[PDB]
Write a protein that binds this DNA or RNA. Structure first.
Lengths: 228, 147, 90
RNA sequence: UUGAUGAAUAACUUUUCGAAUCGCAUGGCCUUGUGCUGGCGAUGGUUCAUUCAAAUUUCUGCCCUAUCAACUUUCGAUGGUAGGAUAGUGGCCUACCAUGGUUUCAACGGGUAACGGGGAAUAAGGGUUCGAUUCCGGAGAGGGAGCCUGAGAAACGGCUACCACAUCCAAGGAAGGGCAGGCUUACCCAAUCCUAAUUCAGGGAGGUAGUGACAAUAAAUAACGAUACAGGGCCCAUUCGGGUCUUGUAAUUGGAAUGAGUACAAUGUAAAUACCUUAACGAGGAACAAUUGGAGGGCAAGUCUGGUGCCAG
RNA sequence: GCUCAUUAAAUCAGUUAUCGUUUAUUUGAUAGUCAUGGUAUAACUGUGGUAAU
C-alpha cells in the first residue's frame, strides 16, 4: 500500500488496486479509498457499488461509475447529495487531502499541459496532465503551463505562462507538494531542471521541472487552497 | 458440545493405551446413518489396516493352524438312511493353512476348537481362490473376494 | 426494562440514513435480544420497525452493558436495496 | 525603443472505411401517399493522445582477491556505411571498410557455504537493537527439436517427427505423462480483495471448525458453628533425665454457601462451534469417590534356617 | 501453479530516454466525398460400419 492514501494497515489484507484511467497509478487515489475509507461514507466494499450505480458521485463533469476509478491531483469530485463539491489537493506531509469548494469553483479546474504539437489538417492541440486534449488553444499556451478548464465544455478560459516568480505547487519528488512561488529555473545535464522554490519561511527547496505545477501568480492562487 | 466430547476422546485413548499401546491408534467412526459410513473414514480405516506390518507370535510359529472356509459333509445318504442319523460323518473341510507346515502324511492328529481331538485322513492343496497379483494401483478386476 | 443511549448520531444522505453508535444498558437482565431493540429504536423515532438495522453488539464484559452500531434508514423499501442479505434474514 | 505579422501534386494497393446499429422525444410542410422531412443521444469505426503494461535504455550504488597485468580482435572485439530482420534502436545479423576497445583511477581473471542480501517494507510504546512480509537468481514439466493461436507464451492442462517409457485389444489397431504419506479430501463466499456482461454470479484466493494435550499457566477437591466424652498432647536430650500446656476424639449435629457437570433462551457468526451473558436443576463420604514417593512397627495352634533348654536369624 | 539445478556491472535499487518502440482494456479528442442483397453451419429425418473414441 502506498503512502498517500491514509489507510490504516488494519482492516483486511489486500490493498485495493487502481484501475487504468486518466491519472498515473502511483499518483491516483481510487474512489473506494475516497468514499468508505477517508470520507467514511460507506462501510463495506459492496456499499461503494450501490452509491456508484445510483450515480450519486460525478467526477470532473462526468458520471464516472467505477469502484477503483483513479482520482488524482486537482480533481473536482462533485457529489449530488448534500450539494457539496470536493476537490483533491495533496498535503505537505506526504498524503492527499479532501477539500470543500464552491459551485463556481467546481466549474473550473487547473491542468498542466504535458506536450503540445500540431495536429492533423493544421490544428494546434495541448495535452493536459489529466489527458484532456483540447483543439485550438492559444499559441501562448506552451509546455508546463497551467490551463483553466470550463468543464461545461472542454474550453480554455484562462492560461498562465511559466515565468519565474509565480506561485507553484509541486507534483512529484522528495519535496513534493508545497507553496514557494519560485526562486528561478536551473539547467543541468540531462535536463533535470530544478525549479527552485522558497516557501513562506523563505527556505530553498528543490524538485524537478516535471514536478512543477503553476497554481497562481505571486500573491494570488487561482483556486481555494485549504487553509489550516 | 465438542468440549465434553473432546474430553471423552482423550479419556478413551488414555484408557486404551494402558493395555495395548505399541503405537496403538483408535479412531472415530461417524454414524450408521444409511446402513453405511462416510467414505473418508472407511478409507482411513482401510489405510490403517494396510500399513500394519504384523509381527509373528510364539504360539503361531510352533503349531500349524488354519481357518475353515467352507464346511462339507461327504457321506452317502444311503449310509444315513440305513444307520438312521446315528453315524459319525465323513467330513471334508476347506481353508488356508498358517504358521508352520502341516505335515502331509495323513494321520497327524489335529484339534477342532470346540469339538474334540480329530485326525486328518486325506490332504489336497488347490489353487487359492483369492490370489495376490503377479508402483501402480490395483486394477479393479484384480481386487477379488471369496465368500 | 431496557434503556438505550445514542452516541455519534451521524446522518448519511447518500444512503439516506441515520447512523449512530448504540450504547445499550442492561441493568439486570442478560442481554437485549436485537429484535427488542429494533422495536425500541423504532419507537424512539418514526421507523416502523424494519427500517432499522442493528448488528455490531459485543457485550461489555461481566454483563451489564453492550455497545454497537445502528443503521436507521428512511423509506423502508430502501432496506431491501442497500442492506446485505444476511441482515434481511435476521 | 515600444508593441504586432511570418518562418498539396502525381500514382499505387489480392482497396480499408465512409453504419443493412439502438433508445427516447412524434413535430413540420401537400400533390395526403401511411409520402416528403426533422431533435437529443447511445454503440461502432479511422487516427491521435491518455493510462495498464511490455521492450530496450541513461545514469549512480554491490562481497573477497596482484599467489589474476594485461585483457579483447581466438561466435564482432572498436567503429564506419549499405542491406536485412524486428514492434522498433542497434554489429542484432551479413557484406565492405578502417585497428581499435578497457586498464595500477585495478581492466580482465579467481573465491562467494550470493539460507546471504535488498529501509523492499512496516515493525518492537524498555525483549537493548526483536518481528513478520516481500524480493532471491536460473531452468524444467519423460528427453530432445520444429511449430500454431493470442495484447501477452517461444504455453508442456496444443500439433509433427525422433528417442525412451507405459496402458487397452477380439492382434486389425486405439490411447496416454507423476503427486502427497512412512523409516482434514469437512463447512462457507459474509468479511477481505479479485473476477465478470458485473449489487446478484464466482475464486481449495480468503475465513471458519476436525485429527494434532508435547512444553507452559490460573483455580477446585471444601467453608463455618454448636453439643457430647475423655486427660493427656507436644518439644529438647549421647545415657540418666529435663521443658511446657486447652489438648484429644474412625463422637454425635446444625444450617448456610458453590462450580465440575447437567440444561432453556439470547448474543456471536454468512451459518455455526466456542467465548461472553443467562434462566431451570445440581454436596453429605458406598460422593460430584487426585495420584506418585519415603519412613516405621505389629500380628498366626503358619513356614523355613541355625543354636550349649524357653533363644537368635 | 509446483519441482530441479547457484548468477559479481549481472541481478536489483532508483533514475531517465522513449523525437527508438508495441499495446486488449481506461479516459480524452476526432470523419459530408435498399419495406432490406447474396450466401451460408447444423440440429433433425432415416441407413450402417467399427473390439473401441
Amino acid at each position: 500500500a502506498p503512502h498517500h492514501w491514509l489507510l490504516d494497515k488494519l482492516s483486511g489484507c489486500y490493498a485495493p488496486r487502481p484501475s487504468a484511467g486518466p491519472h498515473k497509478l502511483r499518483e491516483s487515489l481510487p474512489l473506494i479509498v475516497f468514499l468508505r475509507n477517508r470520507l467514511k461514507y460507506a462501510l463495506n466494499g459492496r456499499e461503494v457499488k450501490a452509491i456508484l450505480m445510483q450515480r450519486h458521485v460525478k467526477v470532473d463533469g462526468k458520471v464516472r461509475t467505477d469502484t477503483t476509478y483513479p482520482a488524482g491531483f486537482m480533481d473536482v469530485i462533485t457529489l449530488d447529495a448534500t450539494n457539496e463539491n470536493f476537490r483533491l489537493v495533496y498535503d505537505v506531509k506526504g498524503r492527499f487531502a479532501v477539500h470543500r469548494i464552491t459551485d463556481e469553483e467546481a466549474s473550473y479546474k487547473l491542468g498542466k499541459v504535458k506536450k503540445v504539437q500540431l495536429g492533423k489538417k493544421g490544428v494546434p492541440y495541448v495535452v493536459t496532465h489529466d489527458g484532456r486534449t483540447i483543439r485550438y488553444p492559444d499559441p501562448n499556451i506552451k509546455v508546463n503551463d497551467t490551463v483553466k478548464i470550463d468543464l461545461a465544455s472542454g474550453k480554455i478560459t484562462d492560461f498562465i505562462k511559466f515565468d519565474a516568480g509565480k506561485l507553484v505547487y509541486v507534483t512529484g519528488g522528495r519535496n513534493l507538494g508545497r507553496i514557494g512561488t519560485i526562486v528561478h529555473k536551473e539547467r543541468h545535464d540531462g535536463g533535470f531542471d530544478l525549479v527552485h522554490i522558497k516557501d513562506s519561511l523563505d527556505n530553498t527547496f528543490v524538485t524537478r521541472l516535471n514536478n512543477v505545477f503553476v497554481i497562481g501568480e505571486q500573491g494570488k492562487p487561482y483556486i481555494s487552497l485549504p487553509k489550516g | 458440545s465438542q468440549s465434553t466430547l473432546r474430553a471423552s476422546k482423550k479419556r478413551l485413548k488414555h484408557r486404551f493405551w494402558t493395555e495395548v499401546y505399541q503405537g496403538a491408534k483408535l479412531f472415530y467412526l461417524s454414524g450408521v446413518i444409511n446402513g453405511r459410513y462416510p467414505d473418508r473414514e472407511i478409507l482411513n480405516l482401510s489405510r490403517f489396516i494396510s500399513v500394519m506390518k504384523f509381527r509373528p507370535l510364539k504360539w503361531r510359529n510352533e503349531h500349524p493352524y488354519m481357518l475353515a472356509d467352507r464346511f462339507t459333509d461327504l457321506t452317502h445318504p444311503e449310509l444315513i438312511e440305513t444307520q438312521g442319523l446315528q453315524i459319525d460323518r465323513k467330513v471334508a473341510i476347506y481353508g488356508y493353512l498358517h504358521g508352520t507346515p502341516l505335515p502331509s502324511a495323513p494321520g497327524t492328529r489335529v484339534h477342532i476348537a470346540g469339538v474334540g481331538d480329530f485326525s486328518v485322513a486325506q490332504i489336497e492343496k488347490l489353487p487359492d481362490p483369492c490370489p495376490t497379483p503377479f508402483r501402480k494401483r490395483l486394477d479393479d478386476k484384480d481386487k477379488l473376494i471369496y465368500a | 426494562a431496557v434503556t438505550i443511549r445514542t452516541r455519534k448520531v451521524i446522518s448519511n444522505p447518500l444512503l439516506a440514513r441515520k447512523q449512530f453508535v448504540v450504547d445499550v444498558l442492561h441493568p439486570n437482565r442478560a442481554n437485549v435480544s436485537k429484535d427488542e431493540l429494533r422495536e425500541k429504536l423504532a419507537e424512539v423515532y418514526k421507523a416502523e420497525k424494519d427500517a432499522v438495522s442493528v448488528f455490531g453488539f459485543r457485550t461489555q464484559f461481566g454483563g451489564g452493558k453492550s455497545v454497537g452500531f445502528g443503521l436507521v434508514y428512511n423509506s423502508v423499501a430502501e432496506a431491501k436495496k442497500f442492506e446485505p442479505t444476511y441482515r434481511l434474514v435476521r
